[PDB]
Design a protein around this nucleic acid. Structure first.
Ligand SMILES: [Ca+2]
Ligand SMILES: [Ca+2]
Length: 291
DNA sequence: GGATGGGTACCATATTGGTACAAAGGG
DNA sequence: CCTTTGTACCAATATGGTACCCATCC
């Protein structure tokens, strides 16, 4: 019984709305897809999303990865109606919304293969142009025409429900325990990172938690980070929030472990060597180091 | 025959997510 | 003086994207 706002936040973080164009004799097939992909560690959270959407689509699994793909046109409408009731708020909103347009053109034609007779098709290709990466260079072989405007959405970014934040953070959050090189101090941090595109949304997080700060990820300012470090702030605001809007997936355990350490810091155990050794043990088994 | 579904191979970079310390700052 | 905090550093892979083939169905 997982929250629709959760689902949206998660697909604001992972999640794609794609239209692919596939040539086949004189005709081009228009293949749409909506996709979440993750590392196989978190297959279970994908199983859960998939049930949220009745049981549309199919999960696929290789060595390291797993993929949820919903490609069929009947299946895709269930999805659209969710995201219409529960709007994305990252730039991904604009790729979803081009995707809707294309879907509508296709429903109004009750088919998905087109003769280069490019009305319906040229429109689709113009739309598809300003979407994700955009045109294959072999669709640029067959078409030199123009691209429609991509809806802006820049202030259009108030966080809609805390649960959004829990799906999103379950996606792009990290829960980290720092130790000094001396091996004498220990500290926590909560970080959520994102492309420049959505700089404006991330800074809005500082309001959402009433703590932390916003900085740059890397010198070539291509990337941004929301970070909290003050233990005051982590123990009062960040932890209690997420106890009430649960994080889902493997990250949930990273959260439990993190907030286990948070407790030993509260009670000052981190300044005793047994506390310190104990924390270190928890650290060696969280995040990418788990199992 | 032609159109569609769907499995799986492949591609690129934005997250993934770890380490480090000088400058607080206060009891 | 001692410990916390903000800010920086950054290698690379878990994300986010895309193309091809064919075997059933219309
Ligand atoms: Ca993302
Ligand atoms: Ca993730």
């Amino acid at each position: 019984s997982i929250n629709p706002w959760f689902v949206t936040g998660f697909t604001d973080a992972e999640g794609s709305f794609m239209i692919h164009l596939e040539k086949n004799k004189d005709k081009w097939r228009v293949r749409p897809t909506f996709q979440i992909k993750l590392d196989i560690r978190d297959k279970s959270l994908l199983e859960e999303i998939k049930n949220y959407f009745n049981n549309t689509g199919s999960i696929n699994t290789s060595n390291k990865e797993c993929v949820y793909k919903v490609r069929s046109l009947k299946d895709i409408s269930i999805i659209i109606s969710h995201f219409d009731k529960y709007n994305l708020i990252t730039q991904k909103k604009a790729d979803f919304e081009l995707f809707k347009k294309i879907i509508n053109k296709l429903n109004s034609q009750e088919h998905l293969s087109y003769e280069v007779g490019a009305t319906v098709l040229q429109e689709i290709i113009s739309i598809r142009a300003s979407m994700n990466l955009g045109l294959s260079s072999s669709v640029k072989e067959d078409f030199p025409h123009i691209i429609p405007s991509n809806r802006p959405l820049i202030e259009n970014m108030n966080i809609p429900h805390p649960e959004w934040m829990a799906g999103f953070v379950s996606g792009e959050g990290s829960f980290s325990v720092y130790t000094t090189s001396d091996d004498k101090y220990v500290s926590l941090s909560f970080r959520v990172s994102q492309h420049n595109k959505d700089k404006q949304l991330l800074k809005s997080f500082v309001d959402f938690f009433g703590c932390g700060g916003f900085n740059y990820h890397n010198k070539g300012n291509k990337a941004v980070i929301f970070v909290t470090r003050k233990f005051e702030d982590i123990n009062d605001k960040i932890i209690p929030l997420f106890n009430e809007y649960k994080i889902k997936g493997v990250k949930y355990k990273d959260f439990k472990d993190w907030s286990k350490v948070a407790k030993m810091i509260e009670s000052k155990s981190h300044l005793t060597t047994n506390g310190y050794k104990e924390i270190c043990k928890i650290k060696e088994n969280m995040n990418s180091y788990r199992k």
